[PDB]
């Protein structure tokens, strides 16, 4: 069984799209999850890789590039072609001010459930963090949450730090309503 | 009285960011962590267009109306933070933040590395006014979430974030993989 890292193209908004949810799923917020497609099309799109969001896509076929999986028809670039997406990474530039330069934050990792436990989800960490390296960014952060500890030994498997002491903030749309009259 | 601005930062206030993240890293005791050099701003800093990457806001403080409370503020630093030697304005605290991608919502955010008031000028009104011109920009560039991290023994930030209508999660840890981790990973 063959794997592939490319980026994302315009061409994969659904599979992306499909992607988020089962994340938000597995996290159990999908009421959260309010992307479209159309929302996809029109934001990650607007700049070079790198310099902004950016996703890559992991590919499986069980031939050369050029497991029970019940939703492989949703999952095919090409209905002619052995190949699917398998799981992605969405990330961006961040900036460790300590550190006076910029680094990347992982949004989202996720290996959909027929395709894991065979090291394709250290395939994309790997993808990222030797573009880390090329880059020269100094530093990758990302958050998970308390009780999934499967990522968390994977992360801290792939030499990762998960820290108990910071905790997460937020201000949703309505509070910056909130403040906006202020 | 005392007038108050907030501005973008440009490539001559590099000094004073640097100070700024230098007194953060004081306050959070981790000193240790910090090898900013102004070098190293100047060459990061200003390479993209404001909002559209690291963005920077400074608080000003002037006694005279600004050239767009009566309590005196004794200041040691006050000469380490002046725009213009010649000029009573003197940069109080800062906003750092940048574009995230809350990618539940499938647009830009934005998300804040550090928002500080140098401790003479706290609890004065300022760290709100930061907060909200953060805000402020993220409605009319019609951002849908700002998030930022706050230590858990910092009561006093968790309490201006809570008033100021932030939800503080107790469930999200923090993930880092450092430089020498990441040399690791590139030999695989
Ligand atoms: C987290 C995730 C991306 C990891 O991807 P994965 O493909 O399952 O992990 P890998 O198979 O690459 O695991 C790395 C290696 O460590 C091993 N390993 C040991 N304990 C492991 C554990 N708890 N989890 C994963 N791998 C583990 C694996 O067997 C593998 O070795 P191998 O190459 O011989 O198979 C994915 O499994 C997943 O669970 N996605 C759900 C989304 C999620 O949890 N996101 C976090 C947001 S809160
Ligand atoms: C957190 C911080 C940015 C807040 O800045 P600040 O200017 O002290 O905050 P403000 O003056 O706007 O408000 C602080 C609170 O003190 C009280 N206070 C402030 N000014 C007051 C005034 N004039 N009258 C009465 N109470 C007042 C209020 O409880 C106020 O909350 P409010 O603004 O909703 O009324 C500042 O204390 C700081 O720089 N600390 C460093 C810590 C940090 O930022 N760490 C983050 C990473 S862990
Ligand atoms: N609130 C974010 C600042 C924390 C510090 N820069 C760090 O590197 O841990
Ligand atoms: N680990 C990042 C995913 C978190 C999720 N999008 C949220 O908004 O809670």
């Given at each position: 069984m063959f794997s592939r890292i490319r980026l994302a193209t315009p061409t994969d908004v659904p599979f992306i799209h499909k992607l988020i949810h089962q994340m938000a799923v597995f996290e159990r917020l999908t009421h959260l999850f309010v992307a479209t497609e159309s929302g996809l099309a029109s934001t990650?799109?607007?700049?070079?890789?790198?310099?902004?969001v950016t996703v890559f896509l992991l590919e499986i076929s069980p031939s050369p590039f050029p497991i029970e999986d019940p939703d492989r028809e949703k999952f095919?670039?090409?209905?002619?072609?052995?190949?699917?997406?398998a799981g992605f990474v969405l990330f961006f530039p961040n900036y460790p001010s300590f550190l006076a330069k910029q680094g990347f934050y992982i949004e989202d990792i996720f290996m959909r459930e027929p395709y894991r436990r065979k090291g394709f989800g250290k395939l994309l960490l790997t993808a990222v963090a030797k573009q880390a390296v090329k880059l020269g960014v100094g530093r990758v952060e990302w958050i998970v949450i308390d009780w999934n500890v499967n990522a968390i030994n994977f992360y801290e498997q792939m030499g990762a730090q998960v820290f108990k002491e910071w905790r997460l903030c937020r201000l949703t749309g309505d509070a910056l309503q909130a403040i906006d009259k202020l």
């Open positions: 990650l799109f607007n700049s070079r890789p790198f310099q902004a095919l670039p090409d209905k002619l072609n052995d190949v699917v997406v």
